[PDB]
Symmetry: C2
Subunit: 294 residues, 2 copies
């Protein structure tokens, strides 16, 4: 039994400029589809789907438009994140859910660890408890592949992979956040029926001991998604810690896995500020500066 | 030949996204170098050179930094245009060149007709007289070739063609505004030494009979520099009109060539608003929308 009655599949799309990783991503699409656990039903009549107007980079680069297929008129016409995120909160209450008895599900750590946290620094919104614990479905998927036996996967995204492996047709268009959500809900549902144990497996914590030793800087990092990741890790206050299925307990919402304080008192402030990175303004980190991490 | 005692070579560099013409260019570099007409001397010691921080698109596009060579750091520490423009105005005063007896010199109509006009709208500043009267050096150059003997030119930018024609070494790097300035300055000097009459040949006007005809809309304009130009001509209030060297009189300064009101009056609102373009709603013009052209 998965211990949540209802699972919320979330995906964002953001602003980007492909060849440049020192980029202050802003949310441009915010999508959710609800999943009924005891009933095993994807409920796509219980949705959230909004576009979002960025403030830092108002014009979407052509390559971003290409990736996401989101046309510029759709963002010009949208509200800013603070407004949209507010609508989100109202919509949540609409669902009459029991605090801590529902979890978000994403295709990776990107959506909540990186995207949501950063956007929320910008919009100056404290990160809520239900974003500080979630189900990284792809990680679960790695385990399911061990159990059920490896397979040759030519697909190129986390979703693509899971759809290929589970032998599921692609829903709609890649990188539309809602379409991404629909693929993940289907994947999740097939996963549960094939025997996957689905719980919270990632927690956002204020502190990790691998951040005490300054990071081995790598000059060409703004051209590598991996290496950018490593610096994203140092800059963002909250870092992803993992947790074994059998170790998770419902009542961990919403206390910090490291410092055990409440999530209205933890992460108002970086606990391992990477001063070592911020000391040479011959090569400064752009996304850290506009966000105001220094 | 030159009725001015001082010539200010001016070049701008802007934000951009190569493949997309429907882009709200903001000034990121502002460069000027003075040329002392009577002594025929370039004056690098009398120059202005500021980077400028954009507000609509704050993170330079990778191809933008590739094109211009401006690193993101130079703009994150820079001032916003409104501030820099005020510095410019101050600089002018302290050099105490008498308005009406200097003129700006550019490599094309781009700097003042497009770039300056648009940015001034963004920054909500009335177009000054000295931007409404200028020397398009390239225009003089095509007449000079006509007078002396055309030759085969392989270079693609205007500065490139002029350097190649007058057989001059490229100064610095292309698309650094200040370097562009130094090139233009050397081209001008040579032009003059070869007997060219260098005087204002382009004026910004409120109105033009050719704009009375609605523009035959090319649906793929956003990916063609030339067809974008057409759109840009209909949106921006002021239009380029040319004037023969024989006709220009110094006291045209501050007086609109078309309507004859003073430029305190002429300019404040669009005389030929392109309403025909602005009705298609599943295909809106982004740069117009963002600047408040509608
Ligand atoms: Mn997605
Ligand atoms: Mn230039
Ligand atoms: Zn904590
Ligand atoms: Zn006029």
């Amino acid at each position: 039994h998965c211990p949540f009655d209802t699972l919320l599949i979330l995906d964002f799309e953001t602003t980007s400029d492909a060849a440049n990783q020192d980029y202050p991503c802003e949310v441009i699409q915010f999508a959710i589809v609800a999943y009924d656990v005891p009933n095993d039903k994807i409920r796509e009549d219980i949705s959230f789907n909004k576009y979002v107007k960025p403030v830092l980079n108002r014009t979407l680069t052509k390559n971003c438009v290409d990736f996401t297929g989101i046309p510029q008129r759709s963002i010009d016409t949208a509200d800013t994140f603070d407004v949209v995120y507010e609508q989100f909160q109202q919509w949540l209450i609409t669902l009459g859910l029991e605090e801590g008895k529902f979890a978000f599900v994403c295709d990776s750590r990107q959506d909540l660890w990186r995207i949501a946290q950063y956007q929320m620094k910008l919009s100056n919104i404290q990160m809520p408890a239900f974003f500080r614990q979630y189900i990284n479905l792809y990680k679960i998927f790695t385990n399911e592949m061990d159990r059920m036996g490896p397979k040759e996967l030519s697909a190129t995204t986390n979703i693509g992979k899971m759809n290929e492996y589970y032998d599921l047709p692609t829903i709609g268009r890649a990188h539309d956040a809602m379409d991404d959500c629909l693929n993940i809900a289907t994947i999740l549902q097939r996963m549960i029926n094939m025997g996957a144990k689905v719980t919270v497996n990632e927690l956002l914590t204020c502190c990790a001991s691998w951040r005490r030793q300054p990071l081995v800087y790598n000059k060409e990092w703004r051209s590598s998604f991996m290496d950018a990741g490593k610096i994203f890790e140092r800059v963002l206050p909250l870092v992803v810690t993992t947790i074994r299925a059998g170790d998770f307990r419902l009542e961990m919402y919403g206390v910090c896995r490291y410092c055990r304080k409440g999530m209205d008192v933890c992460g108002t402030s970086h606990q391992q500020t990477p001063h070592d990175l911020y000391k040479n303004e011959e090569d400064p980190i752009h996304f850290a500066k506009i966000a105001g991490y220094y």
